[PDB]
Amino acid sequence: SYTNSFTRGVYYPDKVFRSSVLHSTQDLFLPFFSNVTWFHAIPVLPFNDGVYFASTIIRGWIFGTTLDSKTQSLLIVNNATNVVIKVCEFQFCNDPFLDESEFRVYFEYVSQPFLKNLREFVFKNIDGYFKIYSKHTPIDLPQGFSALEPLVDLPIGINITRFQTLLALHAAAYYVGYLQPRTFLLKYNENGTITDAVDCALDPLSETKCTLKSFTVEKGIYQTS
Amino acid sequence: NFRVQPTESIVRFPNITNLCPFDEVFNATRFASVYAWNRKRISNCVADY
Amino acid sequence: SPIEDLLFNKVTNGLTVLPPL
Amino acid sequence: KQLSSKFGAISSVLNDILSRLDPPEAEVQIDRLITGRLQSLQTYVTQQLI
Amino acid sequence: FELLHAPATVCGPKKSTNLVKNKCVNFNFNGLTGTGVLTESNKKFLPFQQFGRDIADTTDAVRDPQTLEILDITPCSFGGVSVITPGTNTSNQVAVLYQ
Ligand SMILES: *[C@@H]1O[C@H](CO)[C@@H](O[C@@H]2O[C@H](CO)[C@@H](O)[C@H](O)[C@H]2NC(C)=O)[C@H](O)[C@H]1NC(C)=O
Ligand SMILES: *[C@@H]1O[C@H](CO)[C@@H](O)[C@H](O)[C@H]1NC(C)=O
Ligand SMILES: *[C@@H]1O[C@H](CO)[C@@H](O)[C@H](O)[C@H]1NC(C)=O
Ligand SMILES: *[C@@H]1O[C@H](CO)[C@@H](O)[C@H](O)[C@H]1NC(C)=O
Incomplete structure (x- = not known):
């Protein structure tokens, strides 16, 4: 099933604070009005760059290159106490699933867990790192705008080629997006929150707003590109 | 041109965290x-030598 | 003058800006 | 805005280009950087003159 | 030691110094090297935000790691000097003007 994503998927490109200015950034974001493969499964998914993830019950994310013990692989399991991120040469099944005291799937990083609402997660894999972004905002994606604050950084080093999700056996559905490199224009507020993002490759008014570094344009002629 | 110069130097860096395991390797009962x-x-x- | 007041109110490292004489 | 551009050099910070690097190449890199900055300043002065 | 194969996490112990206020030094806040005064900040940050900037792409506010407070940055007061003088045929005295 396919469903258009209106405007969501905006995360902080850095940890730099800004106050009521406009900051042109060129990083890897989620484009606006791009279709996402809204699943309804109750296999394996390709990884280009980015696992923009949103669901409204499921916990777990398989990451790796071959998914097997031939090279390093990543594992994330979230429960009520903490989060364990185990990286090793781990052997996985074709369709792993959970049970909650028994493990049927087959350095660690113990911190606070990642817990109607909508758990929006944006994943990145560049410069040998791994970055988790999240924002639990209560409510076909709903019409609105919100930021995605950063979280812990995991030094891995290897490249990620394929990924998979998990099913938590007590299900639900989750959106999957894909990021591509482009340029946004983000409007920081006075307090320092991202509240409005405008693209730079859309209908030409958006590109004019990108190339004039302003949100409001007057009548006239503008040469852009 | 007049420019007032700094009079001292400071530096700030975060806490020494996680208390790196080296006493169990450099001081062990059995080897x-x-x-x-x-x-x-x-x-x-962050290491402490 | 009121016209001067209206006109003035409507009109709104290492680099140094000098003040006019 | 032009003050914080690399100008094709190794970096754009004096305390990073004159400490991490070795002066046989650091002299050439800082020469390139100050040449670019002086070119930008000359462009600004010409614009102000016109 | 294994080098040039992975991100580096076994770093040496970098020491820390004491607090300072209202006297511009060559500070170094988690690798951010700069010169400027250290004043109490009236701004409000967010817990994921490290250091601030402005329109002119310059650092204005920084957060120390030892405290949850934030310290503003303002550069040391620079200014050109000028010499008020009459003719040297008239008098030898001069007056110094700071801009
Ligand atoms: C890093 O060290 C500083 C200096 O001790 C810590 O700051 C204070 O530490 C004492 C000692 O436990 C606490 O009682 C205070 O509450 C701390 N003040 C603040 C503002 O945090 C600092 O907490 C340390 N950072 C850590 C542990 O993450
Ligand atoms: C997404 O796919 C649906 C069905 O294939 C289509 O109607 C819609 O126009 C697509 N979205 C965009 C932005 O083209
Ligand atoms: C959560 O999982 C971790 C291992 O991933 C385990 O150590 C911990 O006991 C679990 N907490 C529970 C079951 O409450
Ligand atoms: C910004 O912060 C002020 C208080 O400092 C508050 O009154 C205002 O509502 C905040 N604005 C937003 C958009 O959060």
Whole structure:
């Protein structure tokens, strides 16, 4: 099933604070009005760059290159106490699933867990790192705008080629997006929150707003590109 | 041109965190054999030498 | 003058900006 | 805005280009950087003159 | 030691110094090297935000790691000097003007 994503998927490109200015950034974001493969499964998914993830019950994310013990692989399991991120040469099944005291799937990083609402997660894999972004905002994606604050950084080093999700056996559905490199224009507020993002490759008014570094344009002629 | 100069120097850096395991390796009751040494990896911790 | 007041109110490292004489 | 551009050099910070690097190449890199900055300043002065 | 194969996490112990206020030094806040005064900040940050900037792409506010407070940055007061003088045929005295 396919469903258009209106405007969501905006995360902080850095940890730099800004106050009521406009900051042109060129990083890897989620484009606006791009279709996402809204699943309804109750296999394996390709990884280009980015696992923009949103669901409204499921916990777990398989990451790796071959998914097997031939090279390093990543594992994330979230429960009520903490989060364990185990990286090793781990052997996985074709369709792993959970049970909650028994493990049927087959350095660690113990911190606070990642817990109607909508758990929006944006994943990145560049410069040998791994970055988790999240924002639990209560409510076909709903019409609105919100930021995605950063979280812990995991030094891995290897490249990620394929990924998979998990099913938590007590299900639900989750959106999957894909990021591509482009340029946004983000409007920081006075307090320092991202509240409005405008693209730079859309209908030409958006590109004019990108190339004039302003949100409001007057009548006239503008040469852009 | 007139420019007032700094009079001293400071530096700030975060806490020494996770308390890197080295006392259990450099001060141990028993040790491995000279042919079957056990490799120990220490990471995810700012070292203190 | 009121016209001067209206006109003035409507009109709104290492680099140094000098003040006019 | 032009003050913080690399100008094709190694970096754009004096305390990074004159400490991490070795002066046989650091002299050439800082020469390139100050040449670019002086070119930008000359462009600004010409614009102000016109 | 294993080098040039992975991100580096076993770093040496970098020491820390004491607090300072209202006297511009060559500070170094988690690798951010700069010169400027250290004043109490009236701004409000967010917990994921490290250091601030402005329109002119310059650092204005920084957060120390030892405290949850934030310290503003303002550069040391620079200014050109000028010499008020009459003719040297008239008098030898001069007056110094700071801009
Ligand atoms: C890093 O060290 C500083 C200096 O001790 C810590 O700051 C205070 O530490 C004392 C000692 O436990 C606490 O009682 C205070 O509450 C701390 N003040 C603040 C503002 O945090 C600082 O907490 C340390 N950072 C850590 C532990 O993450
Ligand atoms: C997404 O796919 C649906 C069905 O294939 C289509 O109607 C819609 O126009 C697509 N979205 C965009 C932005 O083209
Ligand atoms: C959560 O999982 C971790 C291992 O991933 C385990 O150590 C912990 O006991 C679990 N907490 C529970 C079951 O409450
Ligand atoms: C910004 O912060 C002020 C208080 O400092 C508050 O009154 C205002 O509502 C905040 N604005 C937003 C958009 O959060």
